Amino acid sequence: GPLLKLFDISILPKSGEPKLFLPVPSLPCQEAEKTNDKYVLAMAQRAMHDVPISSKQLTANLLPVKFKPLLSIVRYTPNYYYWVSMRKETIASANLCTVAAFLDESLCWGQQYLKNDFIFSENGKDIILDTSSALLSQLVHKIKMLPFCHCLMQTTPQDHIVKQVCYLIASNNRILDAVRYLQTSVIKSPIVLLLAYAVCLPAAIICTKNETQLYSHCMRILKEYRPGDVMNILHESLTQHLNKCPSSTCAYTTRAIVGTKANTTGLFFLPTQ
Amino acid sequence: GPLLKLFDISILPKSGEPKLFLPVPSLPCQEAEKTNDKYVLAMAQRAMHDVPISSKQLTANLLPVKFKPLLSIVRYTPNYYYWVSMRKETIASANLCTVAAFLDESLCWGQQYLKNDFIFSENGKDIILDTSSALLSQLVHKIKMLPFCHCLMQTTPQDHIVKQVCYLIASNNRILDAVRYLQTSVIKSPIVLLLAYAVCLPAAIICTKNETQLYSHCMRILKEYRPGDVMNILHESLTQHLNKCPSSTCAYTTRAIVGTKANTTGLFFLPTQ
RNA sequence: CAUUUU
Ligand SMILES: [Zn+2]
Ligand SMILES: [Zn+2]
């Protein structure tokens, strides 16, 4: 007979006059930051804007002296939700250049936690660490968009690992299950190593006292990292790929995922050797 | 003995220069578009730039007269991979403002196919329809990131349908399985309706004659759409949420996912009533 | 859907 109705007519909008913009919920004004340190205040003023990323370079062996000054904002700002929201906006709309920059920043920051005997916890109010889960999800989304030849044209592709780690995160954000799975094999692909680097901080933050062994594995990964590894791994893999992939279309699919340049809104620094 | 080695050291790149960019090849110069229609040529020149979206508004009463002239570029351009890669770059880095604009464009374009008895094909070389799957995946990514009060604070949330459709697309791009699931129920939430609108053209493109029932359902959805509905549905939902949700954290997180303005790079027109 | 993929 007649078909089943498609939808209830009551859910359609009350007005059919054209809307050119979505609502912007303007939010309260920011309080003054709680520091008089003019280097730290300058770093925050530049983090608020999309500065060319070369201007934000910070040599990693100078980061130790800057860590405690920068904590006055990164850990103790009165504008916590404003800063986290700013950074999540950039990450949720990030190309792979932007993802890579934020990953290197977060991992160098995490290594300073270790150097200073800080513990990792989700109640720690840290505007860099508290966007690391959003960043892991974004990295997985970029890897799933790349043509499959990027994973298959590595010396030891470990494609089954890439596929299962991406499924666990994309399907239901199963962060600790992804660590459990990564523990079962030696890592032999640089793409798998990027995923391990990206999972270690958001997993460590959510471990309870019943998951001390998983926490310990996350700290092994964090300690092996060296400043700049995420940018260095991707720069090398993408160059080799252009020199060997025979597809007539891969380069165009890939350029759109990688992007033209990074967006540094919310990024305090790009750490390098 | 020691624990299992973390990774084979050979996968790390040689330390060399500090990396401040990621490599992509440079684009060749453009060929001339195959038309002398000044109106079409002007629309394509604007499409190349992130100009304010009010300057790209098109009343959908005019789209039927412009459809055939515009095919000279959308369907027969000698610059196919330039246009599709430009549009996929914008969509893969898109906030929800941008996703909504491109969805309305694609749905109105698909309606002109239907009105003219054109068929939908994976190899049809259409720079608008060939980005509709990327757009579906990005809409699902945005819905997953919104605080869940957005889906639950609806008259009839159908929260189980939203979650399962999002699972099917995000886990394995199971587009036809998502249509099959949607066809079982009357749609009673605006969020579910947005997902139905976003799925109908990517599904129509990959249906064969062995999926004639699912194809018919996709054509039912496409015919019921009214130009501008994606922006109008999202504007009403976000306006009424802002009035009713009491969470301060929700406002900050929502602003991050929605964004403050659309990126129109690669967008030809924003269709409206 | 009831942890759905491998
Ligand atoms: Zn390739
Ligand atoms: Zn809310």
Residue numbers in the entry:
A (entry chain B), B (entry chain A): 145 to 417
List passages from the publication reporting this PDB structure.
KSHV also expresses several early proteins including ORF57 (Mta), a member of the conserved multifunctional ICP27 protein family, which is essential for productive replication. ORF57/Mta interacts with PAN RNA via a region termed the Mta responsive element (MRE), stabilizing the transcript and supporting nuclear accumulation. We also obtained the high-resolution structure of the C-terminal IHD from hvsORF57 in both the presence and absence of a PAN RNA MRE oligonucleotide fragment. The C-terminal IHD of hvsORF57 forms a compact homo dimer, approximately 65  ×  60  ×  40 Å.
To investigate PAN RNA binding to ORF57 from the structural perspective, purified hvsORF57Δ146 mixed with a 3-fold molar excess of a 17-mer RNA oligo matching bases 34–50 of PAN (PAN17) was screened against crystallization conditions, and produced diffracting crystals. The hvsORF57Δ146-PAN17 diffraction data was solved by molecular replacement with Apo hvsORF57Δ146 coordinates. The conformation of hvsORF57Δ146 was unchanged from that observed in the Apo form, with a Cα RMSD of 0.6 Å (residues 147–417). The RNA oligo was observed in association with the bridge formed by the two α6-helices at the dimer interface, and the electron density was assigned to the bases 44–47 of PAN, a UUUU sequence, plus an isolated nucleotide pair assigned to the 5′ CA sequence of the PAN17 oligo. Within the uridine-quartet sequence, the second nucleotide binds to protein chain A while the third binds chain B, with the linking ribose-phosphate bridging the protein homo-dimer. Specifically the PAN RNA bases U45 and U46 form a π-stacking interaction above the sidechain of Y311, a pair of hydrogen bonds with the sidechain of Q308, plus one hydrogen bond with a water molecule, which is also coordinated by the sidechain amine of K307. R318 forms stabilizing ionic bonds with phosphates of the RNA backbone. The planes of the aromatic Y311 sidechains are angled approximately perpendicular to each other and therefore the U45–U46 bases that they bind are complementarily angled with a tilt of –95° and twist of 112°, the RNA therefore is bent in order to facilitate this protein–RNA contact. The structure of the C-terminal IHD RNA binding site is suggestive of binding preference for pyrimidine and likely uridine bases, and the bent conformation of the RNA as it contacts ORF57 is indicative that the nucleotides should be flexible and not constrained by base-pairs. The four residues K307, Q308, Y311 and R318 of hvsORF57 that contact the PAN RNA oligo are conserved in ksORF57 and the Epstein-Barr virus (EBV) homolog EB2 (R3 site).
